[PDB]
Structure formats: structure tokens, C-alpha cells
Design a protein around this ligand. Structure first.
Ligand SMILES: NC(=O)c1cnccn1
Length: 167
């Protein structure tokens, strides 16, 4: 049993809810929250901007030190950093950004990072300002992630479309 509440069960391991991932993280304090990161860990907008704002910019300070030491992530890659006030850990995962012309086939590689964690609170990778079709992102998630993932969808309209179109 875990603390996640109000989720619709899509599969054996994938759950979904219409929710603000910041508000959900603040309530649950999950072991892992996933950030929709870019390779530079520049948390300017979308899930990343909202998560970083909720940490009072501590996520960005930590991230800048990580990049200064290690250099940029790969598209499809990830790193584990602090979850600050939101979670124990933040898994920063880089999905392809369609608005930068990145290979959508890298979305499966991105979701494979989730398999290193038994339970996660996450957004749909490459959705929102990353430009991918969120229906596609949910299908790749279900077909790739084997660990238990609780998906928070910010938009109510999109949530209802994801549920009502789910195969
Ligand atoms: N939870 C949010 O504030 C958020 C903002 N932008 C995109 C997705 N989620």
C-alpha cells in the first residue's frame, strides 16, 4: 500500500490523475518526483519551472552545480538530485523536445529511466511545451515503464481525453 489517492488505474503498474504535480508532491512527499528536464537543467517553464519555483530556486542552484561538474545530460537520459521540499529525490529526465527537432524515438529511452525506481510521481514526458502528442507519451509510458508510476496531468481537458482514448 502507498499514500497516492484519487488515481485511476490504467494498467497493473500505471495510474493517472488530474493534478498539479507540485501540489501532489507537497501532499505525498514521494520517494521520487520526476522533472521534465532539459539537458542543461535550466528549469525555466512547464513542469520544471513550476517544480523549481516551489523549491524557492534551490533546485536550480543544485542543478547549476551538477552541470558545472558533469556537463549536460543526454536527450533520453537522467540524473538523480535532491527532491528538496517536494520529495526525497528528483529524477530529472530529458524527453525529446519536438519544438527543438529531437527524435521522438528517444521518448522510450527517456521512460526507461523510470525502471530504476520502484515508485515514482511523474508527468507525461515530452508533453506540454516539449511539443509531443500526450496520447503517444502515455502509450510509450505504459509500454516501457514496469515500475509503479503515478502520472499527474495538469490539464483537466487533456486528462479526460487521455482516459477516454486509452486502449
Ligand atoms: N503543475 C504545474 O504547475 C505545471 C505547469 N506547467 C506545466 C505542467 N504543470
Amino acid at each position: 500500500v502507498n499514500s497516492f489517492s484519487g488515481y485511476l488505474k490504467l494498467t497493473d503498474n500505471v495510474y493517472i490523475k488530474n493534478a498539479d504535480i507540485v501540489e501532489e508532491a507537497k501532499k505525498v512527499k514521494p520517494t521520487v518526483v520526476v522533472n521534465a528536464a532539459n539537458v542543461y537543467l535550466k528549469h525555466g517553464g512547464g513542469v520544471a519551472g513550476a517544480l523549481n519555483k516551489a523549491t524557492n530556486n534551490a533546485m536550480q542552484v543544485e542543478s547549476d552545480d551538477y552541470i558545472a561538474t558533469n556537463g549536460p545530460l543526454k536527450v533520453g537520459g537522467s540524473c538523480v538530485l535532491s527532491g528538496h521540499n517536494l520529495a526525497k529525490h528528483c529524477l530529472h529526465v530529458v524527453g525529446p523536445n519536438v519544438n527543438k527537432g529531437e527524435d521522438i524515438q528517444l521518448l522510450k529511452s527517456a521512460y526507461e529511466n523510470f525502471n530504476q525506481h520502484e515508485v515514482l510521481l511523474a508527468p507525461l514526458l515530452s508533453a506540454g511545451i516539449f511539443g509531443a502528442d500526450p496520447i503517444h507519451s502515455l502509450r510509450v509510458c505504459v509500454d516501457t515503464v514496469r515500475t509503479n508510476v503515478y502520472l499527474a496531468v495538469f490539464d483537466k481537458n487533456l486528462y479526460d481525453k487521455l482516459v477516454s482514448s486509452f486502449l
